[PDB]
Amino acid sequence: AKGIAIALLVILVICSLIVTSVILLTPAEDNSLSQKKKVTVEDLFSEDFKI
Amino acid sequence: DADTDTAARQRVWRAFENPHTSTMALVFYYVTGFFIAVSVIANVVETVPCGSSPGHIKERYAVAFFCLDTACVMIFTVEYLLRL
């Protein structure tokens, strides 16, 4: 009974770990690009903004 | 009074369809019930906006759930195949 419960614990931890590995490997991208840089006072006074 | 009486590779079938006979049959029974439960819970928590809706278009929408069903489905198949 309780040893059978230990068997449940073992099989469930095995399946949980393998599916956790699956969900760690599937998101190949797992990344995105956000918005660009806004304009501040330093940007106006940055050398790059010189004409 | 005389309906049924408890009486090989087919032998585990009696263990399989009477899971309260052997430890392996009982553990497989309980774990496949847990798999059914986790699959339906995966479906319902897929339907919730926090999981599979554009709650934050600015940024979550996990497509990992697309795996959770399939594996579970395959798992179920084997016991069905077992009964085959």
Q: What b/e sequence results for B42-56 when a residue is b if at least 16 CB atoms lie within 10 Å of its CB, and e otherwise?
A: beeeeeeeebbeeee
Method: cryo-EM
Hunting for tokens 């847990």 — which residue is that? B34
* Resolution of this deposited model, Å: 4.5
What CA–CA distances, in Å, run from B80 to A30, B61, B75? 36, 33, 9
Q: B14, B33, B16: which is closest to B25 by C-alpha?
A: B16
Q: What's the gap between Cα B65 and its chain centre?
A: 15
Residues of B with Cβ-Cβ distance to A19 under 8 angstroms: 67-68, 71
Distance CA A4, CA A10 (A): 10
Minimum CA–CA partner of A6 in chain B: B27
Residue of chain B nearest A12, judged by CA positions? B31
CA atoms within a 13 Å half-sphere pointing along the CA-CB vector of B23: 9
Kindly determine whether residue A4 and residue B68, on different chains, have CB atoms separated by under 8 Å.
Answer: no
The structure tokens listed for A22 are: 């699956």
